[PDB]
Amino acid sequence: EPEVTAKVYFDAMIDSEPLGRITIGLFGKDAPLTTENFRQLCTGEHGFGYKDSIFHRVIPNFMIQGGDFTNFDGTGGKSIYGEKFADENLKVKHFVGALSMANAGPNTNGSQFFITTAPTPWLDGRHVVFGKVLDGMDVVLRIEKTKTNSHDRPVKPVKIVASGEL
Template sequence: SAPTTASARASSLTFTDCQSYSNPVVFFDITIDDEHAGRIVMELFAHIVPRTAENFRALCTGEMGFGYRQSIFHRIIPDFVCQGGDITNQNGTGAKSIYGAKFEDESFEVRHTGPGLLSMANRGRDTNSSQFFITLKKAEHLDFKHVAFGFVKDGMDVVRRIGELGTKDGKPTETITISDCGQIFLSCSMFEIVFPELLLNQGSVLRTSR
């Protein structure tokens, strides 16, 4: 895990501080052993960590020719984290970012203050790539070591269900797959999430290619 950097702010930011209607919203459709389990909708803190958010957004859409679609959650520890994003080896040993093999820690402003935080998994300082995790509880010991870059806006019930399939050593008891993913655009008039089934004919959802 990466050490504390001098540029990190002393005060923590809450979800309310981090939310912005200009931030990108993305989704994962989840299957558990090939059965649909639901959708996770996430807001990315592009106004705080733009490079980190852009990496995750582009991996959700697959616009660079690779991404999260059909990747798995390979490490799940109950009451701690659900980790995925190994888009190369599918077992936690690989990863690939839109910037290359890895990229630098951007900011540690957002703290791991509760469940539903999106944060980058790493192998030390400045080793971010495509692997990420979603917290299942407050995890202060991860602050200043992992870059938190978003939160679960809807579908925390799906995240909790995934968390129940974990073990102490992290190996899931079932196969949890991101069967589809992409970006969801906000309604300009109501600032509400517009879901894909309402917009497929209007070009308002950017998805991974099939």
């Protein structure tokens, strides 16, 4: 388990139903570029970010995915550096409650990420794990049980009504 150097949070909601706060710890020493990108997307320092985005994809017993604040369907997103940035640390393995970058091959990190809710060894070595859920895991677990439809997208939007640095 790597070192937490910063903490961010997400306040989640599902149609008037407040779910609670997810507190995330970031591994600033092991993934400085990845953490800063995530951190600055949580605060919205650049004019865009996670506030008001949803978790477009939910796969129970596996993970929940969010971060696409441009197309809200999993095809968008962008980093604070530009369109994509390189993989930093690929030696850190996933574990329950880990925050990992989504991508479309090597060095294609944008803003999409997922939170694993189970062991996902088939992702190890291919996705940068840059943090973990410190508090609010129950919230994550509740989001995981939400009703999906086609493409595993929540029938009702799971929204991040607020995000920032703690």
